[PDB]
C-alpha cells in the first residue's frame, strides 16, 4: 500500500514573521486504481480544517504522489504543538497516522563567534572565514553569510552536532578571494534561532 511522510516547516519560515511556515503530509505509492486520499489534520489532538491539497502528481513508476499542506502559526510551532496527519485510502487496511513537532526541551541561546583565517592559509588564493555557533537548543537553525547588504553564497555549513552538555554546535565556513579579504571588506555571519533575541543575531569580521 501507500506510504506517508510528514515533514516539519523550514527553520527560517518558523523564525521569520514575514514568512509562512507549513507542515507537509506526503503520500507516495498511491495507486492508479484508487488515487483518492482523505486527510484529517490534528493540532494537539484537535481537528483543524484549513489544510489544502496540492495538485496531484504522476510519478511515472506506476504511482501517484498526493500532498496535503497545513499552514501553522509561528508561535504554535515554537511553543511545541504536535501536528498529526491521518491518511485514508482504499488500498490501506487501516488509516496511517504520523505526528511531528519541534524537538522537546528547554530552548537555549546560541553563542556566535567569528574567526579570521589562519596565517598559514594566507598563502592560498582563497581563504576561510569561520562562524562558530555553539550552545543552542533545539537544533533548528539557519546560518547565512552576507557582505555590504548582499548575500555571499560561497559557504558550507556543517550539520549540527550534539555536544556533551545536551546542546548543539556547528561551524559555517565562508570562502572568499584573498584580495576581497585583504581589501578590508566586512563579512557578516547571520544566525536565526528561536532562543535569540528577536530570533536573530549578526556577527562581523574584517582584516
Amino acid at each position: 500500500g501507500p506510504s506517508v511522510f510528514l515533514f516539519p516547516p523550514k527553520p527560517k519560515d518558523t523564525l521569520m514573521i514575514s514568512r509562512t511556515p507549513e507542515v507537509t503530509c506526503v503520500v507516495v505509492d498511491v495507486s492508479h486504481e484508487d488515487p483518492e486520499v482523505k486527510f484529517n489534520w490534528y493540532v494537539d489532538g484537535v481537528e483543524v480544517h484549513n489544510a489544502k491539497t496540492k495538485p496531484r502528481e504522476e510519478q511515472y513508476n506506476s504511482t501517484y504522489r498526493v500532498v496535503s499542506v497545513l499552514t501553522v502559526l509561528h508561535q504554535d510551532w515554537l511553543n511545541g504543538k504536535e501536528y498529526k496527519c491521518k491518511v485514508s485510502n482504499k488500498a490501506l487496511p487501516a488509516p496511517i497516522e504520523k505526528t511531528i513537532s519541534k524537538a522537546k526541551g528547554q530552548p537555549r541561546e546560541p553563542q556566535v563567534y567569528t574567526l579570521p583565517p589562519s596565517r598559514e592559509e594566507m598563502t592560498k588564493n582563497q581563504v576561510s572565514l569561520t562562524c562558530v555557533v555553539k550552545g543552542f537548543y533545539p537544533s533548528d537553525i539557519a546560518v547565512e553569510w552576507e557582505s555590504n547588504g548582499q548575500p555571499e553564497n560561497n559557504y558550507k555549513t556543517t550539520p549540527p552536532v550534539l555536544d556533551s552538555d545536551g546542546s548543539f554546535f556547528l561551524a559555517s565556513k565562508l570562502t572568499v578571494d584573498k584580495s576581497r579579504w585583504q581589501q578590508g571588506n566586512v563579512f557578516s555571519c547571520s544566525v536565526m534561532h528561536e532562543a535569540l533575541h528577536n530570533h536573530y543575531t549578526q556577527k562581523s569580521l574584517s582584516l
Binding site: 523564525l15 552576507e146 547588504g149 536565526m192 533575541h197 528577536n198 536573530y200
Partner: peptide, 13 residues
C-alpha cells in the same frame, strides 16, 4: 525593537 534580515522582517518584541 525588531530584527531584519536582508531587509525582511524577522521578529519584533
Amino acid at each position: 525593537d525588531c530584527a531584519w534580515h536582508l531587509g525582511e522582517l524577522v521578529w519584533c518584541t
